[PDB]
Design a protein around this ligand. Structure first.
Ligand SMILES: *C(=O)CCCCCCCCCCCCC
Length: 208
């Protein structure tokens, strides 16, 4: 059914993680580590295969999928661009719905399948052109991720970065804060891209 990352209840408009150098105040520039812009059917990947790559018990993938709805589950493979010092590291997300809601967005960093960091934010709907928009713009990246990126940047070989990234995942759960029904669940897995190629991504439906 799904052709992009979203459902009929909540569509991802844009997502990106970036850094702006200290000199961005003079001449502006931002480096994008990963970036999705949503301005045929998607491919499918069975969710059982990636269970162990995300935490267990409550808030883990199997219990989340168990809860449903199954069509709300996506996997995004990222080729991150780590080719960009004390600048600003940020994440920005924008979603769109037909109805007015208060969203709770939970993001989980997992390492070898265990939760390491979690950030939980709420966002109330804002009524715009015929539809509601939810704007979580310019969240400071947590210090864990910034230090991770700084070290990962420093590894002498790409396949080493890739081996390290094999064990690092992010799970993003968006729910209706009032009714607790799940709206969107996105599993992110990561590889490093090659210098001249910037960030790229591939989106899959998660089935069972
Ligand atoms: C810290 O801020 C806790 C959770 C943050 C979630 C944002 C993750 C966005 C992707 C970061 C880039 C990863 C590149 C390997």
């Amino acid at each position: 059914q799904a052709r992009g990352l979203g459902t009929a209840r909540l569509q991802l408009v844009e997502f990106s993680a970036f850094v702006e150098p200290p000199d961005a105040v003079d001449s502006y520039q931002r480096h994008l580590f990963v970036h999705i812009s949503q301005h045929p059917p998607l491919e499918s990947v069975d969710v059982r295969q990636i269970y162990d790559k995300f935490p267990e018990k409550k808030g883990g993938l199997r219990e989340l999928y168990d809860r449903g709805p199954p069509h709300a589950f996506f996997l995004v493979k990222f080729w991150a661009d780590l080719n960009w010092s004390g600048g600003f590291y940020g994440v920005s997300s924008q979603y769109e719905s037909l109805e007015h809601m208060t969203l709770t967005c939970s993001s989980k960093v997992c390492s070898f399948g265990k939760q390491v960091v979690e950030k939980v934010e709420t966002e109330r709907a804002q009524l715009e052109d015929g539809r509601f928009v939810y704007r979580l713009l310019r969240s400071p990246m947590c210090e864990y991720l910034v230090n991770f990126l700084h070290k990962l940047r420093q590894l002498p070989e790409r396949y080493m970065m890739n081996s390290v990234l094999e064990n690092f995942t992010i799970l993003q759960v968006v729910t209706n804060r009032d009714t607790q029904e799940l709206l969107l669940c996105t599993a992110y897995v990561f590889e490093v891209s090659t210098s001249e190629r910037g960030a790229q991504h591939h989106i899959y439906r998660l089935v069972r």
